Nucleic acid binder design. Structure first.
Lengths: 167, 65, 83, 141
RNA sequence: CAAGGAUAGCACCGGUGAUUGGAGUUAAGUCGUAACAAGGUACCCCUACGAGAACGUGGGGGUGGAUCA
RNA sequence: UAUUAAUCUAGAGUGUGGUAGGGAGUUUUGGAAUUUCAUGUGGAGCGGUGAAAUGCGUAGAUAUAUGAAGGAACACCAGUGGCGAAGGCGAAAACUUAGGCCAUUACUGACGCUUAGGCUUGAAAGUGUGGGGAGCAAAUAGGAUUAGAUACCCUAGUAGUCCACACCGUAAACGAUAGAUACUAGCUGUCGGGGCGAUCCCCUCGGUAGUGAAGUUAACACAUUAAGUAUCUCGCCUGG
């Protein structure tokens, strides 16, 4: 449960006063501590959020709490010293698993194979090389332990047969 | 044509992967549909929510043409 | 979210009651309390209230069984069927 | 052996058997699995002997933990089943019983009804001859 | 004691009564054709109003409409 | 069997682990801009239709750009997509949390199943209650046109559309296909989950789809998500 918190603060404020604004923001932040004022640079906003064409970007990386970020979000919104107060949680859609997250190493292999650094070709994502026939392949069928085989004979292979003699 | 979960990280925020998002973007406030980039439901969620989020934070034109 | 594992293990007296009537009724009661809290904090969540009534009904039936099978269910009744 | 596709309590053994029988008749299927019971074993044995149904195998996991029966229909070498219609009689919502003197011959005096009585389960003819009646499990013709 | 006889309050049911909605019926009554083609405005469903009226328009629910791959 | 005396899981399910939905609600803003006001310039048109006119413009327009305010709703993503009990869910961002998908001899040992009565919810109009009301249209009103427009045209235009509360609690809430339950040729698609592995291909299961076998509606057709197969329960049904 982690919060990636992105704060866009006023206009073209100098680095020192922007950091002080950010420090006030932790002072009004009730979430988990350990977050440090990381300067992401002064990025040009696509539009003036209120009147600021470009805003100072800052990121904070730490854990998260449940009933401790709504109040921080709305206070950071009301606090005009910071324009924008985006939150990100740990859960967006990705995996919490030791056999679907380590599949991101296969994704790194995909990144490697994205560009043909040699004459040979291993590009074109979704190109079936068919290296896998294994996996689960298991619906877990019920094992059969014999109790009584009442006439174990069973009819099979009903060929298309009729009026075998016509000569 | 699937795009995310092969070039993406399955965890899409704005930073560190904004280029894969902008690939279904133009400074015109539009997102490429499945007819050009046939990404699945979760990848479409990624691109939709994240791109309109970048629009929301004033990173790319929200509606501006 | 679900508030699942902690409540189960608190109601899990031994390794022989992971899915017993006791843990089930405890889960339904804890879910009733949590759903009341949530739906008071979130009014128009009709999903929560319909689920709360469904859990109330299933808890009623679980209690009627638990009194049909074991006669000691109501001698220490901290789960009276009234809600 | 390996008996696949187990079935759990649908609402009763009788309807669980009937749905499988009609599905096998529909899809031209050979062998299907259903629940196991003393009544089911008796009726299945008597239907093997009667000729309407082919053999069956009753299987257990270790105990009452899981008891099922797989059963096959008698088919000529033309994919034609010997079963020309089976109707369940004993039902949960309606417990049906008949005396020994009130049991008819099905089809045209050929079909054999399976009847459990006070002292066992048997066929309609020998149920009438036994002078003992009881519930009916299946009308088979 | 009593069949019974009573008071003021009430209660149940029926018919009637200036005046009157609604129904089937006269191959031969009044307006316009709303609407049945996407039927002269596409249909409507729930609901507000008004309009001789077919109906017409609002806010939502749908295609029980065609076009069209 | 209705009952009793016990057990076993496999129905109710529960556990574990992986585990996704525009789910709901709560809390925020951001913009396309709508309208209005001031800065201005402009120097006789704007506007509306099938046709014009009505209407708007010379206290300076058409229109334009800035600044400021108030309301409304969120371009694309939007899916032979998922979820939500239907009602429904799409500008993004967070939280509470219903519920979900995958596999579990795993645990109580039938705890089950529905549902008349009963509990809760229930698009919406429109009702009043407090705000602003940006815009517009029921009603209303002029010019058309008409055999006549309060119909199709528009302008003016309120209730209302907006939100807070109840009530209205009806809908094309109809898939005109009930809920729980198990099974029935396939085939070609998608999404989610589990395994695996450059991707991938692939397998598993569901969800979400279809042609069509069988089966079933007179027929139209459904068809593995049935209107196929069958059990428990309920609701609806006999001429206009």
């Amino acid at each position: 449960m982690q919060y990636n918190i992105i704060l866009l603060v006023d206009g073209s404020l100098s680095l020192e006063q922007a950091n002080q604004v950010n420090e006030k923001q932790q002072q009004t932040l009730t979430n988990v501590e350990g977050l440090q004022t990381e300067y992401l640079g002064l990025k040009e906003l696509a539009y003036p959020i209120k009147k600021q064409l470009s805003a100072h970007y800052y990121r904070w990386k730490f854990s998260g709490d449940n009933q401790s970020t709504k109040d921080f979000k709305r206070t950071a919104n009301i606090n005009k010293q910071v324009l924008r107060e985006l939150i990100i949680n740990l859960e967006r859609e990705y995996g919490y698993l030791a056999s679907i997250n380590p599949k991101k190493q296969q994704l790194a292999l995909q990144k490697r194979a994205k560009y043909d650094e040699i004459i040979a070709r291993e590009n074109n994502p979704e190109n079936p090389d068919v290296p896998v026939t294994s996996g689960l392949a298991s619906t877990q069928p019920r094992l059969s332990r014999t109790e009584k085989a009442q006439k174990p004979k069973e009819e099979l292979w009903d060929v298309v047969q009729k009026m075998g003699n016509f000569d | 044509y699937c795009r995310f979960c092969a070039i993406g990280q399955l965890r899409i925020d704005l930073i560190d992967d904004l280029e894969a998002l902008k690939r279904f973007l133009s400074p015109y406030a539009k997102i490429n549909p499945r007819r050009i980039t046939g990404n699945c439901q979760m990848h479409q969620r990624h691109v939709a929510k994240a791109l309109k989020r970048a629009r929301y934070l004033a990173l790319v034109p929200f509606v501006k043409d | 979210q679900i508030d699942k594992n902690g409540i189960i293990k608190s109601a899990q007296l031994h390794d022989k009651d992971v899915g017993s009537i006791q843990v089930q009724v405890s889960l339904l009661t804890s879910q009733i309390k949590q759903l009341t809290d949530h739906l008071l904090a979130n009014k128009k969540d009709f999903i929560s209230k319909r689920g709360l009534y469904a859990k109330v009904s299933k808890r009623k039936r679980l209690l009627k069984y638990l009194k049909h099978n074991d006669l000691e269910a109501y001698r220490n009744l901290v789960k009276t069927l009234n809600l | 052996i390996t008996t696949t596709k187990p079935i759990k309590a649908h609402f009763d053994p009788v309807a669980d058997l009937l749905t499988k029988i009609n599905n096998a008749r529909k899809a031209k299927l050979m062998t299907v699995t259903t629940i196991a019971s003393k009544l089911k074993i008796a009726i299945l044995e008597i239907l093997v002997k009667e000729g309407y149904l082919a053999n069956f195998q009753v299987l257990e996991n270790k105990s009452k933990t899981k008891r099922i029966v797989t059963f096959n229909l008698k088919y000529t070498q033309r994919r034609i089943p010997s079963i020309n219609g089976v109707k369940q009689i004993s039902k949960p919502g309606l417990r049906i019983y008949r005396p020994f003197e009130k049991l008819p011959l099905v089809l045209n005096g050929l079909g054999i009804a399976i009847i459990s009585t006070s002292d066992g389960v048997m066929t309609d003819k020998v149920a009438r001859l036994k002078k003992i009646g009881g519930e009916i499990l299946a009308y088979v013709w």
